[PDB]
């Protein structure tokens, strides 16, 4: 710039890529669009036609009678356990119809989803620099990436297989959730207790700020349809920050006074919640879980009169482990007599 | 030698003191249950 350098083929290509259009391509579109399209298209193919009868030993497709809730692109078996399951690789060796049968279509979706999520976050950078804004939308989307990378990639790369990853289906998540209660006691990891407060806390800021604005509006029209009275290029604001302060100051006790700090606080609460829950899954990947309190397992060991809901939860975790792990981990080839599993009575 | 022209000042208003002290005590309520086991 400002010295008259010449134009190369790369410079010519950039104008077509960063041309305004109905859908923005950019440079990140080369990473995003062929990696995002094959991810969900590889999900809809697997949930519809592709079985899971050889990997887990259970039907998972619409072509087998599973509905929308019970269809899943299932994880590979624990034989492979860390292979990338390339369609050319030694576990598949070119044959496509035997590649899907070993559960290798899971890794086609998880790996093409990861390079989608890199590309989509890069999409938010070059659009922001084009319109000359600040990058905070890109910085918030890192928290969905930290949840994706830790749960779907770091956790199987710490456990014994890709088998124990979540499968890309509705009810298949529902065992992965129930896997973590019995086998990990994941509800007592405070990193999940700070994840919940991020989720439920951000749901509360979405409901108050959306209702405080909507009830402190300025009368600018005369029809009672108050959405009609907003010219979006107007210089004045549309609601009363003074009145909204005094409402929650007397209802609740402390309220906001700063419209800049408020929307940033709505940024900080969900992002900190997921980032403080991606740390907890890292400990589970090494099985550094917060399973026990030592000083109450000792006291419940020597005395059959003492209990809490905590000791009532340890029995329920035993009920999940000693019951579902016969079918959940079929590679362990284990069978159970009906006397070795714990029960109550009748 | 010369005085540094990068001298800046740091401030922490009262509404930020309350987010600080309430941050520290709450997760100290959280994690102290686990430190004593």
């Amino acid at each position: 710039g400002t010295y008259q350098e010449k134009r190369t083929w790369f410079d010519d290509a950039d104008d077509w890529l960063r041309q305004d259009r109905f859908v923005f391509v950019g440079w990140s579109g080369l990473l995003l669009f062929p990696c995002a399209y094959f991810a969900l298209g590889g999900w809809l193919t697997g949930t519809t036609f592709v079985t899971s009868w050889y990997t887990h030993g259970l039907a998972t497709s619409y072509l087998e009678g599973c509905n929308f809730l019970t269809a899943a692109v299932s994880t590979p078996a624990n034989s492979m356990a860390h292979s990338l399951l390339f369609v050319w690789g030694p576990e598949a060796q070119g044959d496509f119809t035997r590649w899907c049968q070993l559960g290798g279509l899971w890794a086609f979706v998880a790996l093409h989803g990861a390079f989608g999520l890199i590309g989509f976050m890069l999409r938010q950078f070059e659009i922001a620099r084009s319109v000359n804004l600040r990058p905070y939308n890109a910085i918030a989307f890192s928290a969905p990436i930290a949840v994706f990378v830790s749960v779907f990639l770091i956790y199987p790369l710490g456990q014994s297989g890709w088998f124990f990853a979540p499968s890309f289906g509705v009810a298949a998540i529902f065992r992965f959730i129930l896997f973590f209660q019995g086998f990990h006691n994941w509800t007592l990891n405070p990193f999940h207790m700070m994840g919940v407060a991020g989720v439920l806390g951000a749901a509360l800021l979405c409901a108050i700020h959306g209702a405080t604005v909507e009830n402190t509006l300025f009368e600018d029209g005369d029809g009672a349809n108050t959405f009609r009275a907003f010219n979006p290029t107007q210089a004045e604001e549309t609601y009363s920050m003074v009145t909204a302060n005094r409402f929650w100051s007397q209802i609740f006790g402390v309220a906001f006074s700063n419209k800049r700090w408020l929307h940033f606080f709505m940024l900080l609460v969900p992002v900190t919640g997921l980032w403080m829950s991606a740390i907890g899954v890292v400990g589970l990947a090494l099985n550094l879980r917060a399973y026990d309190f030592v000083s109450q397992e000792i006291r419940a060991a020597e005395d059959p009169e003492f209990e809490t809901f905590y000791t009532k939860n340890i029995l329920l975790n035993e009920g999940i482990r000693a019951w579902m792990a016969a079918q959940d981990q079929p590679h362990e080839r284990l069978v159970f007599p009906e006397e070795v599993l714990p029960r109550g009575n009748a | 030698a010369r005085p540094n022209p990068n001298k800046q000042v740091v401030e922490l208003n009262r509404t930020s003191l309350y987010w600080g002290l309430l941050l520290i005590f709450v997760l100290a309520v959280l994690f102290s249950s686990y430190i004593f086991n």
Partner: peptide
């Protein structure tokens, strides 16, 4: 011993909540 350490940290949090309401930094208009 820890049963009184817990109750310090509970009523300690309730301390700030008293001071954050009545002794707050008063917001001044304009």
């Amino acid at each position: 011993m820890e049963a009184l350490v817990y109750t310090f940290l509970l009523v300690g949090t309730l301390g700030i909540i008293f001071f954050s309401i009545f002794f707050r930094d008063p917001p001044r208009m304009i």
